[model samples]
Target: MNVWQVVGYKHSGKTTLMEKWVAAAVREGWRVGTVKHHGAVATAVEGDGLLQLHLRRPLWRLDDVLALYAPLRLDLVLVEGYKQERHPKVVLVRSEEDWASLQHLANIRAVIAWEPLEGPLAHPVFSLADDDEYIPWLMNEVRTR
Candidate 1:
């Protein structure tokens, strides 16, 4: 599957972009699978770190989730989080720190910044809130891939 990630901190337009991208891909008749990291806090284990103590729930890694999604027969998989993964990504830059956090990450296909940032960045940078440009650019990237 062609995998892409939209990653950043809370409220940086990850879901909004995902919605638009999913719709666009669907319009082109490409089946899409989506995964969103529900929240920073996941489940809890109520006992000591023992074998039986794991009865509360199973902890799923990103690999497991992707494996589950594989059977959906999707042409593309858009993941809304997990910045640590090495998938090619479009990172949302809402602040200096936001860019700083993911700057060293690999396979950063492009960047969507709140404002036009100065050049010399390793990847292409596009405007935030408005996706007219990035959407088409992303579509082309997908097509070529």
Candidate 2:
């Protein structure tokens, strides 16, 4: 399974980015699936051969979600909000404070900044304002890596 994580603190635009990637992947000819972080209070929606799940209790382990995605044989599985996992990920930087704090995260494939930084980051960096280049680079990474 190809798993890519989008993780950050709340209100850092994790959900919005995932939505963009998911739609773009489908438009670009990939069979995609998504698993978000959250239950007995969980919710599921199914139709048109798709299942959308949202868990409201103990959040299921990341491995558990990956296992679930495996049988479906998706080309890409976009995981939203699982910060501690080791999958190759795109980290969101909302500020210089977030920039400094997010430095230690492992397997960062790229960095997306909400606000401009003064200098270069360790990985390929892009602005949230310009995914025109970022999204293409991101898709290639997923396909090649």
Candidate 3:
């Protein structure tokens, strides 16, 4: 039941970064699972018949997604959104204001910035453009923390 959270606003490249991490983790002999929290947007309505009926409540699809891996074990679970939950987290900041606004959240373990800023960050910071650089570090942190 271990997990890591990636918190950010929409279009901050969080999904892009998650894709890269999945590829890298798999190449390194790890299995990764992803959990995504939706806002007003709807997910899981891609098919026909049953699809049209289920759009009313997407949260009900959670167990379906989780059960897909019931027979397998995973090394990491990367969750997007759900920022309100207290978990070891990597917060995405697109601006200094966003950084300042989230700095006080006690659950934050580090940051991934879309733009550069000065000084030592409240925690280790990496560029979302180069999130792969932090994968090893993140893997280690997850193992020991």
Which candidate comes out best when scored by TM-score? 2
Q: Report, for every candidate in turn, its global Cα lDDT versus the true structure.
A: 0.80, 0.82, 0.73
Tell me the TM-score of model 2.
Answer: 0.83
Angstrom error at residue 99, model 3: 1.6
What overall lDDT, based on C-alpha atoms, would model 2 receive against the true structure? 0.82
Question: Where does candidate 1 stray beyond 4 Å?
Answer: 39-57
Residues 1-145, model 2: lDDT tens digits: 8889997777777776787888889999898988776526878999998787766445568888778778877999998876778999998888878878776888998888888766666788788777788888888889896
Order of quality (lDDT): 2, 1, 3
Model 3, runs deviating above 4 Å: 39-72, 118-120
Give the per-residue lDDT digits (tens) of candidate 1, residues 1-145: 7899898888777777888899899999998888777733445455665322221235766677788678878888998888888888999888767887778877899988876655368888887766888888998898898
Reference-based lDDT, residue 13, model 2:
71
List the RMSD of every prediction in angstroms: 8.0, 2.9, 5.6
Candidate 1 structure, TM-score to reference: 0.82
Model 3, 1-145: lDDT tens digits are 4578887777766787678767777788877788886654545654554443223453545456556545568777787876666768888888887877777665888788888866566688888877657877877787785
